[PDB]
Subunit: 175 residues, 4 copies
């Protein structure tokens, strides 16, 4: 049983546009921020909104920082054959580079997600504040092909280090 | 006889959207996954669909991996003057990096191809499962300018090493 | 109070498309050319128009040079939740790499800004000549969420070095 | 007199879509292939069409190679304020890397140019065969702001080395 037929028809048997919560856990060896997207030129973009002071001392009430979700590999051009777990790999370039389970408790930010598709031209949006990002969680599978949307928003806790990627790299140079 | 006149008209004399099979063989010194596309803003994208377990032990029922087909050079923006052989160069970044003629026998994957063009906005799709990807094959030419579509799907076997690109690089470090 | 609700609605309470002047000052440790943008697929592009002679001796009456404003990070794909300060980081790749407060006094150039968005397809444009680019200035904040558009065009002077980025790097190699 | 007013209107005073010939000469220290474009989301793309045999011995009747004309800098997103000289910088990545005035005499290729713009969605095309690419030529200026379209297609010869970029680099390693 293939997911897509030779002529292009999809063989997937199906409030469910974006998961209510986002999560941060390990996947393929990298601390990753993840959230789920349900349902031509379907592209996704993420911005991190936050108040901050530049080293120059300037206070930016609402600054927007980019959150890489496929822009450099084309992974942001989505094939919505079924629910997708969008991944933001936290690295030195990420605004979450020094975000730890601890700091999250006091952090204040808003991850805005923008999904655009098609002529049809539409825009779906969502937002994840710090309290809606769950450290140490992982999404339940939804594909069984059948999709169980009752598990769309569900996540569970898994063994995840509390330190940020920056702290992980620091502890490595020494050890 | 030019292929395109000064004013832009094409001088090509013409179920034929995508070749029924894909192939893997050498071209310009690189192991390459190839398939043919027949017929504004005409762009092509490829996703590799497959079930896999992350090193974290998580099982992803249907994960989508990117398959580079011109995204970084602009080669994915197609000029459909006639049938085109789309090329995915298998390198360290490719999900097929360690795919060999042997492993293919037991592998399970699905290459999904998405072609979008134009206002017109349309989407053509296709799919290639492991059994529809022929190792050691090459496509017959279709351009003679006249296009012989009876050879569109035809491929023939050519001397091709059975090892994966990863194995090729390993055998090189030592030898 | 979040900026964007879970369903995507924006919670911002609002001649105001582009700031009348642009500025050049330090932000996050980099000399930056900045201007403000007010109000799908909303993208911004900047071109530097100027007359110049190539080392070959050829005079180009009106040559267009690129001005990086997010093209390589996706920051040029705008989320117009409120007024945005567009940033062009002046580096070795920038046409303003050797622009100093001094040279500006004799320079002659025109920064053209092109904003495109959406179906809707529209184009807003503006222009900043050398006399409309203020060295040593910074924009006043407009977000308080409420936006005070009376401060949209307002800027004030701040302690800024008069030397160009190229001169900064030169003085560093030696010192 | 600015080229563009604060509100975006252009101050330019105007068979003229593409120059009949292309040229290859030095500009800003680089051997460059150039051609002129006259007249939203206005983007240009170039493909090099040619018959060739792969080292594997395979003959490709009509292979398409990419010709970089701004794809990596955004310079391919055009601002048609007046006639533009499109530039393809010949480097190690260019299909013209080893093209010399000599080889051109026997070469056989076709540079296809594709211009797309906007809703409006249109496509203008053109083609330049080897005999329509003039080595050692430069375009006359058209901007004086007034545009003299009688000089649109005009080019003149200038002192240009006959060797290819590859040969230039070879002669450098030794000398
Ligand atoms: Na479009
Ligand atoms: Na890119
Ligand atoms: Na890049
Ligand atoms: Na449209």
């Amino acid at each position: 049983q293939r997911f897509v037929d030779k002529n292009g028809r999809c063989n997937v048997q199906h409030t469910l546009m974006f998961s209510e919560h986002a999560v941060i856990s390990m996947r393929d060896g990298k601390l990753t921020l993840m959230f789920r997207v349900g349902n031509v030129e379907a592209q996704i973009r993420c911005k991190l909104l936050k108040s901050r002071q530049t080293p120059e001392g300037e206070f930016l009430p609402l600054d927007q920082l980019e959150l890489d979700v496929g822009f450099s590999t084309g992974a942001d051009q989505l094939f919505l054959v079924s629910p997708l777990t969008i991944c933001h790999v936290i690295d030195a370039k990420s605004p979450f580079y020094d975000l730890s389970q601890r700091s999250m408790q006091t952090e204040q930010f808003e991850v805005v997600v923008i999904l655009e598709g098609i002529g049809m031209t539409c825009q779906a949006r969502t937002s994840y504040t710090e309290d809606e990002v769950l450290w140490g969680h992982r999404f339940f599978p939804v594909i069984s092909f059948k999709v169980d949307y009752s598990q769309f928003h569900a996540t569970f806790e898994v063994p995840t280090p509390p330190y940020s990627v920056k702290e992980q790299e620091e502890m490595l140079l020494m050890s």
